[PDB]
């Protein structure tokens, strides 16, 4: 053979490259020198290919991999074809059950390091020294949809981190919003069945916009806080890099003296917080159902590593009852104004997996996987989680040895008396499989709890009460946090929330369900309630207009850390700009353009009405990455149109649509020279409009303007003007 092109263009370069410059590849092939302890210990199961013969799984070389064995060349296939049968059998058994929830997700390897030793508050070894590096494997996800569902759905997002520490795996299994929808794990199946596809016909996929979700929510007001977050732009993240992460539950840090400190875990995006707008997210589910998964992969291949800061909200044991909400109540957030997040470390995601199925599909995270230094609390949602993840993994990964699947193995020692189980890899030589034993001198042996390298001992919390199936009365308050969240949003964030509720409830077929939801909103905030009501053609009653608003939270009437955008934190590095080409581009605009983007780490995609290449005024040959229809404005953060021969694209319906879409979706648009004729398509005044960069040519002032707009992410002052754009 030799099917590869002689020029070597089938293989991507093993160096950082921008999105779309090269074919993506397995991490170890794309960045062979990006290493960490976990990645290196996976080297025993990694399998190459180049220069090897094709074989059965028993090692027998195959001569003809194109044909079954038959009696005559037009005869019947023969039972003795063991090569065909092994190949089809393995193929026939490829699939395993997807995750019950969070089936759709994207993962990467990276590392964690603390900013300082935290031994005063925890004896956790991975937190003990700023020079201790811990390998991580992180999986981001949606909740409801199948493994084949779309990424940019409206949804809570999962954010799970497996820390491979020297004293055990610690999995921090969180989401992108600080609370959950429900209080007690006993209701998880009910909730999840309500949000998932309805059982008669299994519709709708990956959406909460259906009758059973809003029915459950209308009947269970504890859900309203997380529903608020889901209806906000938090439920449609621009990227997994630009969203927050939260453990949700209050846990415990145990120091070496044995002091317990209540803690809530936080991941702060160093790229900043950024979300899509609903019409763009929903259209993206059809043009690129893999958008987030692709963006993650290509940000890492480009060297735009996703980086997050680990943060702790720390509350002393004596302050347990100092708030006006229960700290164990998972539908309640701890406002950063009351208890600040202490920046404790940084996590960097810097290498993709080699095989999606082996590493991401088979990875198993569990909140119950803790290490000495950490402990649980009585949070009734967390308590029930401790049982489920272990149970579900027995069938999802076929047995009790899922910790022997390479991605799941600890990198530290593990020795015990557990044996057998389906697909047992470990061959134990211990003469004993029980303890106490004398035949192996009682090894492996228990270890007393201690300051370092000690055995696990639970914090000795005092437990007093009767065995009861009862919700704590302290958990019975459902509207103050939703109200606090609502008042902390900017006006346009508020409007997005209203629009999220209105669009979802418009899809509820049974009108009484929408009315019961609006009634719940009336208990939160009347302006929110009226605005949703008005979109549903509902009139609030007399009684609903007089509902007394819930109390503030510990004196707070808002908290800007709950907004995505109130406090400017945007970052342009890794964002992408679409450049609309023409057949004779002013090459001086392109150079100014590309030089400037490249200095801010912003990528570009050269678009035209056909593939191939175009030639600039000076004769520069410009390669086209995609067409206008093929890489729609939904996929980029901004649109730039350089001068040249605009008449080539001024009547291109796709070109005009590109700008109208980008305009509708509040993205920065820049028009150089004769590209200013596109102003009429998006009806921009002669004097201009904030959000639209326009100049005689593409100099440095023009690129600074555009890049300033990109750092502000979207042009929120344009909201009022997009009503009147048919797009």
């Amino acid at each position: 053979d030799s099917l590869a092109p002689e020029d070597g263009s089938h293989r991507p370069a093993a160096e950082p490259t921008p999105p779309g410059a090269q074919p993506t590849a397995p991490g170890s092939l794309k960045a062979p020198d990006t290493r960490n302890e976990k990645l290196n210990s996976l080297e025993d199961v990694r399998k190459g290919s180049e220069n090897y013969a094709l074989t059965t799984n028993q090692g027998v070389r195959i001569a003809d991999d194109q044909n079954s064995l038959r009696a005559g060349s037009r005869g019947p296939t023969l039972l003795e074809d063991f090569i065909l049968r092994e190949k089809i059998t393995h193929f026939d058994h490829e699939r395993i059950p997807e995750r019950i929830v969070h089936a759709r997700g994207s993962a990467a390897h990276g590392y964690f390091q603390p900013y300082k030793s935290l031994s005063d508050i925890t004896k956790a070894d991975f937190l003990s020294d700023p020079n201790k590096i811990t390998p991580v494997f992180v999986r981001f996800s949606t909740v409801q949809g199948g493994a084949g569902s779309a990424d940019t759905v409206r949804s809570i997002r999962g954010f799970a981190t497996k820390f491979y520490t020297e004293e055990g795996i610690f999995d921090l299994v969180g989401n992108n919003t600080p609370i959950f929808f429900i209080q007690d794990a006993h209701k998880f199946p009910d909730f999840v069945h309500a949000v998932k596809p309805e059982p008669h016909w299994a519709i709708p996929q990956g959406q909460s916009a259906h009758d059973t979700f809003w029915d459950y929510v209308s009947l269970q007001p504890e859900t309203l806080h997380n529903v608020m977050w889901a209806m906000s732009d938090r439920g449609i993240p621009r990227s997994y890099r630009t969203m927050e992460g939260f453990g949700i539950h209050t846990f415990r840090l145990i120091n070496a003296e044995g002091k317990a400190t209540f803690v809530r875990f936080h991941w702060k995006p160093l790229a900043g917080k950024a979300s899509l707008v609903w019409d763009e997210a929903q259209k993206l589910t059809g043009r690129d159902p893999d958008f987030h998964r692709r963006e993650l992969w290509e940000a890492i291949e480009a060297g735009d590593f996703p980086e997050y800061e680990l943060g702790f909200q720390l509350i002393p044991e004596e302050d347990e009852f100092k708030f006006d909400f229960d700290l164990l109540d998972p539908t309640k957030l701890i406002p950063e104004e009351l208890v600040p997040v202490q920046r404790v470390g940084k996590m960097v995601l810097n290498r993709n997996p080699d095989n999606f199925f082996a590493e991401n599909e088979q990875a198993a995270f569990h909140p119950g996987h803790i290490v000495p230094g950490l402990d649980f609390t009585n949070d009734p949602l967390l308590q029930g989680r401790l049982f489920s993840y272990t149970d579900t993994q027995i069938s999802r990964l076929g047995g009790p040895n899922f910790h022997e699947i390479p991605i799941n193995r600890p990198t530290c020692p593990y020795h015990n008396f557990q044996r057998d189980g389906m697909h047992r890899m470990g061959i134990d030589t211990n003469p004993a499989n029980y303890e106490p034993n004398s035949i192996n001198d009682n090894w492996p042996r228990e270890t007393p709890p201690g300051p370092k390298r000690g055995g696990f001992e639970s914090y000795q919390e005092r437990v007093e009460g009767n065995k009861v199936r009862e919700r704590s009365p302290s958990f019975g308050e459902y509207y103050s946090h939703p109200r606090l969240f609502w008042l902390s949003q900017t006006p346009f964030e508020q409007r997005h929330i209203v629009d999220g509720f209105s669009f979802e409830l418009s899809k509820v077929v049974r009108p009484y369900i929408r009315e019961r939801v609006v009634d719940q909103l009336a208990h939160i905030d009347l302006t929110l309630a009226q605005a949703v009501a008005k979109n549903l053609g509902i009139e609030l009653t007399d009684d609903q207009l007089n509902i007394t608003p819930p109390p503030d939270v510990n004196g707070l009437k808002k908290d800007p850390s709950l907004s995505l955008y109130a406090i400017p934190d945007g970052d342009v590095k890794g964002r992408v700009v679409a450049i609309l080409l023409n057949d004779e581009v002013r090459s001086a605009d392109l150079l100014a353009i590309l030089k400037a983007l490249k200095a801010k780490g912003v990528h570009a995609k050269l678009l035209y009405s056909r593939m191939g290449e175009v030639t600039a005024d000076d004769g520069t040959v410009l390669p086209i990455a995609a067409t206008f229809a093929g890489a729609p404005s939904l996929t980029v953060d901004a649109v730039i149109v350089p001068c040249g021969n605009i008449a080539d694209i001024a009547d291109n319906g796709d070109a005009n649509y590109y700008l109208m879409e980008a305009y509708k979706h509040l993205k920065p648009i820049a028009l150089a020279g004769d590209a200013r004729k596109f102003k009429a398509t998006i009806k921009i005044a002669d004097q201009g409009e904030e959000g639209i960069v326009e100049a005689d040519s593409a100099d440095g002032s023009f690129m600074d303007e555009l890049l300033t707009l990109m750092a502000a992410h979207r042009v929120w002052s344009r909201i009022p003007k997009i009503d009147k754009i048919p797009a």
Copy 2:
């Protein structure tokens, strides 16, 4: 309890209604008078719900389905809470492996009847008498995507029919195009791996528009015929009702005298043939990823029964 609205607008009318008029429902509640032999024999396993107490799977009545058992109302959950563990355990084990191919599909019950006896060419009992009616169960599907992928992708479509005949189940497992991509079964795993999401990153979902697929096609010219079909509007049917169906392979019919006749199986849409245009199909994967499943369900609920010859 008093949860359903007093006006009864929670329950859909048990009668044929047009799309959007009533909330959709399980078939035996939506159309209780529709029957066939297969639907009747499923009766011993159907489970109701109205007026029954809530219980564990062992039949123990539950008093509080809102809470876990704990030591104090703010205490730790107890291991003895067998009601919680049974409920969460069953939830934990709800999934099964999706199909290797054609994981995304929509199905419906129906019946088949031959126009006339075919005993001169086949001794198949289900084709032996115009009065003999055979219950069927049919599943329509895409090929590449997972169970959670979108319906109106560009794809070949499966059309599988299970015939519950009096001499055995006959499954007629076809597609909506008259040929397949490949010639020998030994290459199936090669072709399917090439069409499926590439192995390093698992992109793209439900689409053939990516390098490995065209790579495979370009090296295996036998695939061009079905590729042509897939690139045409045949790849984006308007509805499972407006697409043809084919068994593709030449099979044999065997009569009572032992005479063999080569046969190729066909399904003709009595609603006629119709497809979307690409832009509309791709945008609909975004706006309504369940559009064909929904359209099939609603046509049946409306009485626009999908019909095929």
Copy 3:
């Protein structure tokens, strides 16, 4: 804790030691220096224990492995105890389905080496050079019984060898008899269901002595050949080391020139052929259900490595139709008098596993696993087998990745485009998962067939005929092979066969089934049929008495290779003798006895009426291995009673019974000095009798006489004398 004895006696020495001398142990601790390529490649999954901390599977050290977490020391167990839950969860899921047939088996590691290149007849790499060593893993088994059934039942034995060749795994899956019960694989479920426990009550375990088996046999005369073998002493082998092994089916050897030669595979036991007698075997199923497993393991711990010679019956393509029987009929043997077994190589089993579950229980052998140089034939039983092993392994071993379980992995390279599946360990880096591809330059690639290291290509056998479900008329002959077998047996063997059928038919409750089997025996041989009928109180009719005997097989009226004992082949090394002590043994006798046994590699077990020690006449302290009742005569090959204070045990019922049982089961007995007072117990004349060694002391020829008797295995001449005797 530090529970071992300070003397270090909890630990067996890492050196060859006789059976019973030390506690047995995992192979790699008992013989660390016994290595081979496969044994070395498993080192990546072997797990130690000593000096390691006890942990969870996630690597978290455990402090208290004696207690659950509860709310108070007498309170309820908490759901948050994740250590308890992982520990119980793994335990709860330890079991996997047992093999459908051959569930009971015992296995060991070893190696194979050919005597000379066989390149002229086969291009199989493991047979091409006498210096080429192939690691093997072998499992011996019963057929019907569960994994927990007894070793010494009457039954065919499995003898499966996994050859880890440089060109792939080759599994040689045979039995201990040269034919099988049935001709076509479609009846395997019927035959197996008939021999297995009857469905209503699941009785009887591990035995063919019941109605459904004999019902099936009486309606399917194709089974008689293998039923004869099973009813003979072949069905109750003394040890897996003293039985023959056969591939049964005719396969093909393909040389580099493309020439096909027909072959039947044989294994010759270098320890010789030896079986138990029925009463002893049956009693041994109760006293020690693990006798074969134990003997195999202790033989290897003592250095008595089981050794077998691989032999080939070779038949040219031109002689396919030259026999009276069809070569492709698995119910027919190839008489060694017609086609000699050509010695090919030697297999030595020299190391036990470390963990029975991991290596033995999960080992997957498959007769379809062949390598270039071998090929199948149309034998219809073989043809269906090729489908079954692959299939059954998907459920028994949890998925299509069972080749990744350590014991099953090829030691040679394996690369292909198969992906995923449950429990996937291999992380593929190939950009391509399909071929032909250009993106990896088509790797891994197909390899043409050739003399060495080429791809597999099936032999181009001509196929011709119609698609039919039809038994070949050449297979319709059922009685001449059974007759040949019968006539080749010694007279005491024939009697044992008659006793086997008689006993088994006596457990058949429906008398007509017994009558029908008798009618079938009457088509084989009249003497056999009459003797069995007499034992059942059945009279043959005049017609049955006139059935004409089936023809000879190609002129043969007998073939001594078919007998276990017609041709002496006794080997004493590794046998074991019971020494019945008294409380003042003449140490002079003991010294003579022990030295002589040791000189021949014959083991001894010192027995007494209690455990502890006894002191010889000269003050030698003698350690007792077991009591008379605890290590019964069933477990030794011979019995020696030295002089001393015989009055100590003269009236010991167990001591007397011990001799009665050993005498009844035809074992050599030696009585020294006053030990001759035991002659009355077994009714021995004053003058003596062949099979009883007696002298004034254990000097001179006393040990040589006893060892000559051991070399002939049992005292067949004593049969008539045991008839009576109440034991």
Copy 4:
């Protein structure tokens, strides 16, 4: 769950209750029972919340655990009275 292949082991004939069993558990490997309830969750309004919880009582009542008093710290400890 592994011995009997999934969570629907209560549907294997010998294991089935002879009394009524109704709840909102669904799916799982080898699911026999075909549920017609429009709802697979509670509380629900679309099936008027059936099947419903039943208060504890003298006969045919819902299960309620005996309210035993629990007092102690979280410990992995054998009671001294067991020694």
